[PDB]
Design a protein around this nucleic acid. Structure first.
Ligand SMILES: [Mg+2]
Ligand SMILES: [Mg+2]
Ligand SMILES: [Mg+2]
Ligand SMILES: [Mg+2]
Ligand SMILES: [Mg+2]
Ligand SMILES: [Mg+2]
Ligand SMILES: [Mg+2]
Ligand SMILES: [Mg+2]
Ligand SMILES: [Mg+2]
Ligand SMILES: [Mg+2]
Ligand SMILES: [Mg+2]
Ligand SMILES: [Mg+2]
Ligand SMILES: [Mg+2]
Ligand SMILES: [Mg+2]
Ligand SMILES: [Mg+2]
Ligand SMILES: [Mg+2]
Ligand SMILES: [Mg+2]
Ligand SMILES: [Mg+2]
Ligand SMILES: [Mg+2]
Ligand SMILES: [Mg+2]
Ligand SMILES: [Mg+2]
Ligand SMILES: [Mg+2]
Ligand SMILES: [Mg+2]
Ligand SMILES: [Mg+2]
Ligand SMILES: [Mg+2]
Ligand SMILES: [Mg+2]
Ligand SMILES: [Mg+2]
Ligand SMILES: [Mg+2]
Ligand SMILES: [Mg+2]
Ligand SMILES: [Mg+2]
Ligand SMILES: [Mg+2]
Ligand SMILES: [Mg+2]
Ligand SMILES: [Mg+2]
Ligand SMILES: [Mg+2]
Ligand SMILES: [Mg+2]
Ligand SMILES: [Mg+2]
Ligand SMILES: [Mg+2]
Ligand SMILES: [Mg+2]
Ligand SMILES: [Mg+2]
Ligand SMILES: [Mg+2]
Ligand SMILES: [Mg+2]
Ligand SMILES: [Mg+2]
Ligand SMILES: [Mg+2]
Ligand SMILES: [Mg+2]
Ligand SMILES: [Mg+2]
Ligand SMILES: [Mg+2]
Ligand SMILES: [Mg+2]
Ligand SMILES: [Mg+2]
Ligand SMILES: [Mg+2]
Ligand SMILES: [Mg+2]
Ligand SMILES: [Mg+2]
Ligand SMILES: [Mg+2]
Ligand SMILES: [Mg+2]
Ligand SMILES: [Mg+2]
Ligand SMILES: [Mg+2]
Ligand SMILES: [Mg+2]
Ligand SMILES: [Mg+2]
Ligand SMILES: [Mg+2]
Ligand SMILES: [Mg+2]
Ligand SMILES: [Mg+2]
Ligand SMILES: [Mg+2]
Ligand SMILES: [Mg+2]
Ligand SMILES: [Mg+2]
Ligand SMILES: [Mg+2]
Ligand SMILES: [Mg+2]
Ligand SMILES: [Mg+2]
Ligand SMILES: [Mg+2]
Ligand SMILES: [Mg+2]
Ligand SMILES: [Mg+2]
Ligand SMILES: [Mg+2]
Ligand SMILES: [Mg+2]
Ligand SMILES: [Mg+2]
Ligand SMILES: [Mg+2]
Ligand SMILES: [Mg+2]
Ligand SMILES: [Mg+2]
Ligand SMILES: [Mg+2]
Ligand SMILES: [Mg+2]
Ligand SMILES: [Mg+2]
Ligand SMILES: [Mg+2]
Ligand SMILES: [Mg+2]
Ligand SMILES: [Mg+2]
Ligand SMILES: [Mg+2]
Ligand SMILES: [Mg+2]
Ligand SMILES: [Mg+2]
Ligand SMILES: [Mg+2]
Ligand SMILES: [Mg+2]
Ligand SMILES: [Mg+2]
Ligand SMILES: [Mg+2]
Ligand SMILES: [Mg+2]
Ligand SMILES: [Mg+2]
Ligand SMILES: [Mg+2]
Ligand SMILES: [Mg+2]
Ligand SMILES: [Mg+2]
Ligand SMILES: [Mg+2]
Ligand SMILES: [Mg+2]
Ligand SMILES: [Mg+2]
Ligand SMILES: [Mg+2]
Ligand SMILES: [Mg+2]
Ligand SMILES: [Mg+2]
Ligand SMILES: [Mg+2]
Ligand SMILES: [Mg+2]
Ligand SMILES: [Mg+2]
Ligand SMILES: [Mg+2]
Ligand SMILES: [Mg+2]
Ligand SMILES: [Mg+2]
Ligand SMILES: [Mg+2]
Ligand SMILES: [Mg+2]
Ligand SMILES: [Mg+2]
Ligand SMILES: [Mg+2]
Ligand SMILES: [Mg+2]
Ligand SMILES: [Mg+2]
Ligand SMILES: [Mg+2]
Ligand SMILES: [Mg+2]
Ligand SMILES: [Mg+2]
Ligand SMILES: [Mg+2]
Ligand SMILES: [Mg+2]
Ligand SMILES: [Mg+2]
Ligand SMILES: [Mg+2]
Ligand SMILES: [Mg+2]
Ligand SMILES: [Mg+2]
Ligand SMILES: [Mg+2]
Ligand SMILES: [Mg+2]
Ligand SMILES: [Mg+2]
Ligand SMILES: [Mg+2]
Ligand SMILES: [Mg+2]
Ligand SMILES: [Mg+2]
Ligand SMILES: [Mg+2]
Ligand SMILES: [Mg+2]
Ligand SMILES: [Mg+2]
Ligand SMILES: [Mg+2]
Ligand SMILES: [Mg+2]
Ligand SMILES: [Mg+2]
Ligand SMILES: [Mg+2]
Ligand SMILES: [Mg+2]
Ligand SMILES: [Mg+2]
Ligand SMILES: [Mg+2]
Ligand SMILES: [Mg+2]
Ligand SMILES: [Mg+2]
Ligand SMILES: [Mg+2]
Ligand SMILES: [Mg+2]
Ligand SMILES: [Mg+2]
Ligand SMILES: [Mg+2]
Ligand SMILES: [Mg+2]
Ligand SMILES: [Mg+2]
Ligand SMILES: [Mg+2]
Ligand SMILES: [Mg+2]
Ligand SMILES: [Mg+2]
Ligand SMILES: [Mg+2]
Ligand SMILES: [Mg+2]
Ligand SMILES: [Mg+2]
Ligand SMILES: [Mg+2]
Ligand SMILES: [Mg+2]
Ligand SMILES: [Mg+2]
Ligand SMILES: [Mg+2]
Ligand SMILES: [Mg+2]
Ligand SMILES: [Mg+2]
Ligand SMILES: [Mg+2]
Ligand SMILES: [Mg+2]
Ligand SMILES: [Mg+2]
Ligand SMILES: [Mg+2]
Ligand SMILES: [Mg+2]
Ligand SMILES: [Mg+2]
Ligand SMILES: [Mg+2]
Ligand SMILES: [Mg+2]
Ligand SMILES: [Mg+2]
Ligand SMILES: [Mg+2]
Ligand SMILES: [Mg+2]
Ligand SMILES: [Mg+2]
Ligand SMILES: [Mg+2]
Ligand SMILES: [Mg+2]
Ligand SMILES: [Mg+2]
Ligand SMILES: [Mg+2]
Ligand SMILES: [Mg+2]
Ligand SMILES: [Mg+2]
Ligand SMILES: [Mg+2]
Ligand SMILES: [Mg+2]
Ligand SMILES: [Mg+2]
Ligand SMILES: [Mg+2]
Ligand SMILES: [Mg+2]
Ligand SMILES: [Mg+2]
Ligand SMILES: [Mg+2]
Ligand SMILES: [Mg+2]
Ligand SMILES: [Mg+2]
Ligand SMILES: [Mg+2]
Ligand SMILES: [Mg+2]
Ligand SMILES: [Mg+2]
Ligand SMILES: [Mg+2]
Ligand SMILES: [Mg+2]
Ligand SMILES: [Mg+2]
Ligand SMILES: [Mg+2]
Ligand SMILES: [Mg+2]
Ligand SMILES: [Mg+2]
Ligand SMILES: [Mg+2]
Ligand SMILES: [Mg+2]
Ligand SMILES: [Mg+2]
Ligand SMILES: [Mg+2]
Ligand SMILES: [Mg+2]
Ligand SMILES: [Mg+2]
Ligand SMILES: [Mg+2]
Ligand SMILES: [Mg+2]
Ligand SMILES: [Mg+2]
Ligand SMILES: [Mg+2]
Ligand SMILES: [Mg+2]
Ligand SMILES: [Mg+2]
Ligand SMILES: [Mg+2]
Ligand SMILES: [Mg+2]
Ligand SMILES: [Mg+2]
Ligand SMILES: [Mg+2]
Ligand SMILES: [Mg+2]
Ligand SMILES: [Mg+2]
Ligand SMILES: [Mg+2]
Ligand SMILES: [Mg+2]
Ligand SMILES: [Mg+2]
Ligand SMILES: [Mg+2]
Ligand SMILES: [Mg+2]
Ligand SMILES: [Mg+2]
Ligand SMILES: [Mg+2]
Ligand SMILES: [Mg+2]
Lengths: 63, 100, 51
RNA sequence: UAGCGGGCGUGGAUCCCUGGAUGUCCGAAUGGGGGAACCCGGCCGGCGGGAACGCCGGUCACCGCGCUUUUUGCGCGGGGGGAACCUGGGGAACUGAAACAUCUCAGUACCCAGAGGAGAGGAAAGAGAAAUCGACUCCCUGAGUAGCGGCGAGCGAAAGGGGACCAGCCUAAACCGUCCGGCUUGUCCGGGCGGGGUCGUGGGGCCCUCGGCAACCGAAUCCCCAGCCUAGCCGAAGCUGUUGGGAAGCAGCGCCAGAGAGGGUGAAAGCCCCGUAGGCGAAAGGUGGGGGGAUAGGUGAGGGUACCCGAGUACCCCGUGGUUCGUGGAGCCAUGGGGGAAUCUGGGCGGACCACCGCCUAAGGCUAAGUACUCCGGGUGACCGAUAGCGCACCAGUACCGUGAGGGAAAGGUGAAAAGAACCCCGGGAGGGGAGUGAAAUAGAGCCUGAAACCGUGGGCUUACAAGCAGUCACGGCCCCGCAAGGGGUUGUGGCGUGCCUAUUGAAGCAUGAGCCGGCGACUCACGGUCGUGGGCGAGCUUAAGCCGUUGAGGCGGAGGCGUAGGGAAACCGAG
């Protein structure tokens, strides 16, 4: 009775204006040590998912 | 209580079925069963003796009570609905045309 | 709203609508109203919604 | 509830409503005992000759409170039950986390105590950002937001806004009078009673100046009334024919309608009966602020003084609970342990802490309404119709089962009317056959309709040299319906032929399930999503609770929600 929004998702995914769904690239908080400078710059951006991306949206909706 | 209904021990007409038209004084009215007894609906009870005692009990064509709604009162004319009218002292039912 | 209009409207196009006023047969009495409807084309042949 | 056998009623019974009377015994059970419904007493009085015995009437439990000169007593109260609802004290686990321990289920189940027609809560030591709101409760919304969370599963507020309802009060303390007790005579020590006082524009006490008040408020307390409740009463309009076992059907003409709701009457009735619409009614009891009256209460302004303003409390620390808050930066509310103030230049709060700016007055209590429930009464169903519907339509919480707690069925139908089959016949009876009733007895009494499995009697076809999922195709014979070209039943021979379901790579399978028949039996609903689809409207669309209206009628209600701007963690900026 009245769906609860999944907070785990809300806390780490943003649903874009057109429908797409973005989030940060994985592995970047401690994996490094000297990993290429190119690595961490590209791990700095965010991206779009696809099929889970559509699974994702369902976990929100009021959101 | 409330059982009160059309007529009592007095003259009445049977608009029933078998004895339609027939007329006679009601000799008995039983409110519990909601039924009256006149002089029609006589029935052959070939039964031997009624009560345990006595010799022959008779096949008496005793009058079978009729549904109280199968009989209608009657007064100086034909059978007519009742219409309760009260005088200056108390109350006495007047028929639709004449009185009582 | 539309429905209420379209109903009244549908009923108006059929020509079975009828505004009145001259209820000479006031004071609650069936036989009287019968007279009024008589002299009004409501012969009781058709179902009437009297608003 | 009929039968035998007796009575009553218009000097108005039965019956219905109100009040009263009597009410053995057990049961909170209350003189005492006790294995509830039984046993045994004290005291006062009565009855029988009545001392011994017995009966009868009255009285005698316990606890709390107030008196009582203490004693002994007197008075008021308590005790137990209640379908669900309510508050409080205690308080699980399965389960979810696809294991599990934090967490979840859940402060749920349940145990206990208590309250009442409700209970709880309730007149800010509040909320929290507006220098704003102004008791409490309940609905909508805010909001699945803020936030909580092995940041897992999952949990999940408040302010504000729209509504229902609407109410506010009493004390403690200073201070004055009185009574009792006390000492070391003081506006003194304690205690009871009365006056005084009651709050955040801080109030009150005590002093000085002015009404030395008529007035004005006014009950939640009383009293009267309306009204409603517990029986009731009046209430319009139809006759002829006709078929029928039976008219209410059919046919002709007619009427009533503030009544054409419904039930009954042998079938289908506005006008036959009870009713319906619309009206009327209480000696008695209950209810009764809706209206009216009364009382209890209650209220002004400066100036002065620093008398009072609820203590093992505030406050801090330790251990915890509550909240959205799981130790988190963790306040706030609550409190088991320890330390331990002040009386308004006093204290608490606005999320560690400090300053500033504000809010509020703790440590005493009471308060109606709006809200919850349904044992009970009424009304209504796109609710069931006897394997359904409450477990129970019926003599059911029964029969029966269990030591017990506890479990717990089945069982409705003659007919309009009993008219329930006299009498005769066979029979010990049962049961039949005549007769008789009825429209019908194939309605005959567990009796409406009476399906299937299952059992049997009669008849047609068929079968004792034949190997079978039982059938199917063909032909032929016998029998039967239309004299007739056709079709039905049956089966002799010949061709062909590995049940049904389930589960499986694969089943006739020696894998699963089914004796057979009948009935019961399984993808629902609520809320929230997503897509499609049928419509309304359109840069707009839509209301929610609720209110007005109805009594199957709708309308009002924009609080709020979605959309018209995105990007960013954010500050912020913006078609970027
Ligand atoms: Mg919802
Ligand atoms: Mg979540
Ligand atoms: Mg990281
Ligand atoms: Mg780090
Ligand atoms: Mg390293
Ligand atoms: Mg590499
Ligand atoms: Mg970088
Ligand atoms: Mg009478
Ligand atoms: Mg006849
Ligand atoms: Mg009138
Ligand atoms: Mg009239
Ligand atoms: Mg009329
Ligand atoms: Mg009797
Ligand atoms: Mg009799
Ligand atoms: Mg007599
Ligand atoms: Mg007399
Ligand atoms: Mg009388
Ligand atoms: Mg009484
Ligand atoms: Mg009585
Ligand atoms: Mg009595
Ligand atoms: Mg007696
Ligand atoms: Mg006892
Ligand atoms: Mg007693
Ligand atoms: Mg005993
Ligand atoms: Mg004695
Ligand atoms: Mg003697
Ligand atoms: Mg004596
Ligand atoms: Mg005695
Ligand atoms: Mg005694
Ligand atoms: Mg005692
Ligand atoms: Mg005690
Ligand atoms: Mg005492
Ligand atoms: Mg005392
Ligand atoms: Mg006293
Ligand atoms: Mg004494
Ligand atoms: Mg003493
Ligand atoms: Mg005493
Ligand atoms: Mg008493
Ligand atoms: Mg009960
Ligand atoms: Mg509780
Ligand atoms: Mg567990
Ligand atoms: Mg769950
Ligand atoms: Mg588990
Ligand atoms: Mg699991
Ligand atoms: Mg396990
Ligand atoms: Mg646990
Ligand atoms: Mg909990
Ligand atoms: Mg609780
Ligand atoms: Mg707890
Ligand atoms: Mg617990
Ligand atoms: Mg107790
Ligand atoms: Mg109780
Ligand atoms: Mg109570
Ligand atoms: Mg009460
Ligand atoms: Mg209350
Ligand atoms: Mg109420
Ligand atoms: Mg209360
Ligand atoms: Mg509450
Ligand atoms: Mg209270
Ligand atoms: Mg600010
Ligand atoms: Mg302002
Ligand atoms: Mg406000
Ligand atoms: Mg205030
Ligand atoms: Mg509230
Ligand atoms: Mg409610
Ligand atoms: Mg509401
Ligand atoms: Mg996190
Ligand atoms: Mg997990
Ligand atoms: Mg919880
Ligand atoms: Mg609000
Ligand atoms: Mg509000
Ligand atoms: Mg309401
Ligand atoms: Mg209301
Ligand atoms: Mg003394
Ligand atoms: Mg002394
Ligand atoms: Mg003292
Ligand atoms: Mg003193
Ligand atoms: Mg003193
Ligand atoms: Mg004193
Ligand atoms: Mg006073
Ligand atoms: Mg004053
Ligand atoms: Mg002063
Ligand atoms: Mg009041
Ligand atoms: Mg009454
Ligand atoms: Mg009544
Ligand atoms: Mg009248
Ligand atoms: Mg009448
Ligand atoms: Mg005539
Ligand atoms: Mg007729
Ligand atoms: Mg006919
Ligand atoms: Mg006719
Ligand atoms: Mg004529
Ligand atoms: Mg009928
Ligand atoms: Mg008809
Ligand atoms: Mg019909
Ligand atoms: Mg017909
Ligand atoms: Mg009728
Ligand atoms: Mg009139
Ligand atoms: Mg009336
Ligand atoms: Mg009436
Ligand atoms: Mg009246
Ligand atoms: Mg009366
Ligand atoms: Mg009265
Ligand atoms: Mg009177
Ligand atoms: Mg009286
Ligand atoms: Mg009285
Ligand atoms: Mg009463
Ligand atoms: Mg009452
Ligand atoms: Mg009362
Ligand atoms: Mg008045
Ligand atoms: Mg007064
Ligand atoms: Mg002053
Ligand atoms: Mg001084
Ligand atoms: Mg102290
Ligand atoms: Mg003190
Ligand atoms: Mg204390
Ligand atoms: Mg410690
Ligand atoms: Mg603490
Ligand atoms: Mg905590
Ligand atoms: Mg933790
Ligand atoms: Mg917790
Ligand atoms: Mg944390
Ligand atoms: Mg810290
Ligand atoms: Mg703080
Ligand atoms: Mg403590
Ligand atoms: Mg201090
Ligand atoms: Mg201050
Ligand atoms: Mg200060
Ligand atoms: Mg505090
Ligand atoms: Mg504090
Ligand atoms: Mg605050
Ligand atoms: Mg700290
Ligand atoms: Mg505050
Ligand atoms: Mg106190
Ligand atoms: Mg209340
Ligand atoms: Mg209330
Ligand atoms: Mg309600
Ligand atoms: Mg009820
Ligand atoms: Mg009821
Ligand atoms: Mg009912
Ligand atoms: Mg039905
Ligand atoms: Mg049955
Ligand atoms: Mg039940
Ligand atoms: Mg049952
Ligand atoms: Mg019953
Ligand atoms: Mg029952
Ligand atoms: Mg019995
Ligand atoms: Mg029973
Ligand atoms: Mg059963
Ligand atoms: Mg009968
Ligand atoms: Mg007969
Ligand atoms: Mg019989
Ligand atoms: Mg016979
Ligand atoms: Mg014979
Ligand atoms: Mg014989
Ligand atoms: Mg024998
Ligand atoms: Mg015989
Ligand atoms: Mg015969
Ligand atoms: Mg038959
Ligand atoms: Mg036959
Ligand atoms: Mg019988
Ligand atoms: Mg029987
Ligand atoms: Mg039988
Ligand atoms: Mg049969
Ligand atoms: Mg049979
Ligand atoms: Mg059969
Ligand atoms: Mg057979
Ligand atoms: Mg046969
Ligand atoms: Mg045969
Ligand atoms: Mg044949
Ligand atoms: Mg051979
Ligand atoms: Mg085969
Ligand atoms: Mg052939
Ligand atoms: Mg042939
Ligand atoms: Mg031949
Ligand atoms: Mg032949
Ligand atoms: Mg053939
Ligand atoms: Mg064959
Ligand atoms: Mg063959
Ligand atoms: Mg074969
Ligand atoms: Mg296998
Ligand atoms: Mg094998
Ligand atoms: Mg086999
Ligand atoms: Mg096997
Ligand atoms: Mg198996
Ligand atoms: Mg098998
Ligand atoms: Mg199977
Ligand atoms: Mg079977
Ligand atoms: Mg088997
Ligand atoms: Mg068997
Ligand atoms: Mg079966
Ligand atoms: Mg069933
Ligand atoms: Mg089904
Ligand atoms: Mg489904
Ligand atoms: Mg829906
Ligand atoms: Mg849906
Ligand atoms: Mg569309
Ligand atoms: Mg369209
Ligand atoms: Mg559209
Ligand atoms: Mg436009
Ligand atoms: Mg809403
Ligand atoms: Mg209103
Ligand atoms: Mg209304
Ligand atoms: Mg209404
Ligand atoms: Mg309505
Ligand atoms: Mg009306
Ligand atoms: Mg209607
Ligand atoms: Mg409505
Ligand atoms: Mg309107
Ligand atoms: Mg608006
Ligand atoms: Mg809007
Ligand atoms: Mg607007
Ligand atoms: Mg407004
Ligand atoms: Mg929403
Ligand atoms: Mg858009
Ligand atoms: Mg953002
Ligand atoms: Mg910028
Ligand atoms: Mg541009």
């Amino acid at each position: 009775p009245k769906m609860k929004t999944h907070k785990g998702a809300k806390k780490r995914v943003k649903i874009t204006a057109s429908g797409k769904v973005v989030a940060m690239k994985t592995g970047k908080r401690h994996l490094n040590w000297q990993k290429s400078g190119k690595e961490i710059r590209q791990k700095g951006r965010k991206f779009v998912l696809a099929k889970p991306e559509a699974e994702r949206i369902k976990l929100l909706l009021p959101y | 209580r409330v059982k009160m209904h059309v007529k009592k021990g007095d003259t009445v007409l049977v608009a029933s079925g078998k004895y339609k038209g027939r007329v006679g004084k009601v000799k008995e009215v039983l409110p519990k069963k909601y039924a009256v007894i006149v002089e029609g609906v006589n029935i052959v009870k070939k039964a031997v003796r009624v009560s345990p005692k006595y010799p022959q009990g008779g096949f008496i064509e005793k009058e079978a009570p009729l549904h109280a709604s199968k009989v209608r009162p009657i007064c100086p004319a034909c059978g007519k609905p009742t219409r309760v009218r009260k005088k200056f002292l108390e109350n006495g039912k007047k028929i639709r045309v004449c009185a009582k | 709203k539309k429905g209420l209009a379209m109903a009244v409207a549908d009923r108006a196009r059929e020509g079975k609508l009828l505004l009145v006023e001259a209820f000479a047969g006031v004071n609650g009495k069936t036989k009287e109203f019968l007279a009024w409807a008589k002299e009004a084309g409501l012969d009781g042949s058709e179902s009437v919604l009297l608003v």
